[PDB]
């Protein structure tokens, strides 16, 4: 030996590893591994979790009669609020399972691990000496997860207001959220929608255009590695029917005539989009709701005329009253 520390540092920072294990990665594997082992055990076999603190539970496990679509990891009890609730603060194992302990374990380790993934990205890109900005493009789903799992709960006052980890659980969260805050008319959610449809659309456009122009591609290969001449043949003419549509829309909006603005714009669109909606979800965490119109049209007789906004307010009311077991005397509320 050379005294294990020197071997250990070479082992960690090696880029000849099949899977890079950096110094972020050294935190990342235990956290992500804990999160996933707890998740699959909980999803399969966590007994029903009381979620309103009235001793009426909800089953999310698969051995208690769910399928893939109806199952979930049920969030923490409403009694707990925002308290930190490790397993040694409970007094028995069965009551830690009855109050929804594991859910907090999963999300805390998951956010740590998914942050370290971004770190590990930045570090490896630093070793190969390339412009390290793949990480800022990833910071958009990461920002989104902070907003949905950590911040909206804090803003409302409890982790009982978090998103369940399950398929129908997400749908339940979405519907209830629209009921209490009117997300559709929030302009930031609109920026979000725009961003992901536009991302999908520009993905199809780019792909279709590129695969029509490529001709043949070959790069020299050796018996242990790769070559140093990347050959590539493409078509190099286009017509004036993609000059009134593509040419004088893109040269004018990109602010360049250069091809290097294509791939800069491709990533900018959805990233900005998902930041905007990630920001919006947090502003409703402090209850700044979106536009809603009731009684924006009245005639000069003094009778009200309805509009589409009022129909959506009716449907929202319908969802919202169904969500409320707690009392029938509630005038003005949340949080």
């Amino acid at each position: 030996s050379a005294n294990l520390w020197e071997r250990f540092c070479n082992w960690v920072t090696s880029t000849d590893n099949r899977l890079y294990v950096g110094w972020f990665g050294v935190i990342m594997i235990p956290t992500l591994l804990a999160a996933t082992i707890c998740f699959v055990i909980a999803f399969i076999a966590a007994p029903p979790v009381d979620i309103d603190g009235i001793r009426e539970p909800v089953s999310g496990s698969l051995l208690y009669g769910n399928n893939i679509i109806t199952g979930a990891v049920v969030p923490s009890s409403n009694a707990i609020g925002l308290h930190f609730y490790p397993i040694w603060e409970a007094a028995s194992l069965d009551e830690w399972l009855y109050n929804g302990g594991p859910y907090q374990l999963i999300i805390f380790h998951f956010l740590l691990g998914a942050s370290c993934y971004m770190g590990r990205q930045w570090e490896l890109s630093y070793r190969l000496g390339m412009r390290p900005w793949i990480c800022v493009a990833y910071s958009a789903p990461l920002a989104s997860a902070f907003a949905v799992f950590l911040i909206y709960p804090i803003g409302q006052g409890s982790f009982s207001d978090g998103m369940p980890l399950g398929i129908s659980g997400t749908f339940n969260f979405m519907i209830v959220f629209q009921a209490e805050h009117n997300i559709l008319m929030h302009p930031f959610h609109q920026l979000g929608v725009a961003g992901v449809f536009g991302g999908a659309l520009f993905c199809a456009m780019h792909g279709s255009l590129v695969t029509s122009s490529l001709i043949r591609e070959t790069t020299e290969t050796e018996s242990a590695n790769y070559g140093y001449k990347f050959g590539q043949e493409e078509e190099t003419y286009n017509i004036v029917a993609a000059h009134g549509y593509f040419g004088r829309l893109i040269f004018q909006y990109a602010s360049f005539n250069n091809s290097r603005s294509l791939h800069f714009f491709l990533a900018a669109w959805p990233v900005v989009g998902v930041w905007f909606t990630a920001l919006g979800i947090s502003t409703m965490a402090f209850n700044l709701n979106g536009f809603n119109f009731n009684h924006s049209v009245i005639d000069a007789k003094g009778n009200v005329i309805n509009t589409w906004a009022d129909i959506i307010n009716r449907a929202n009311l319908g969802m919202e009253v169904m969500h409320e077991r707690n009392a029938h005397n509630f005038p003005l509320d949340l949080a």
């Binding site: 099949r18 899977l19 399969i44 698969l62 051995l63 399928n67 018996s223």
Partner: peptide, 28 residues
């Protein structure tokens, strides 16, 4: 009946992960 089917299909996905990482086709 149903749940065994569910976990078996899960298990072979994660096996397929292992196969795609440590046994990829050598591109030559």
């Amino acid at each position: 009946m149903e749940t065994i089917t569910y976990v078996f299909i899960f298990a072979c996905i994660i096996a397929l992960f292992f196969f795609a990482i440590f046994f990829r086709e050598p591109p030559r």
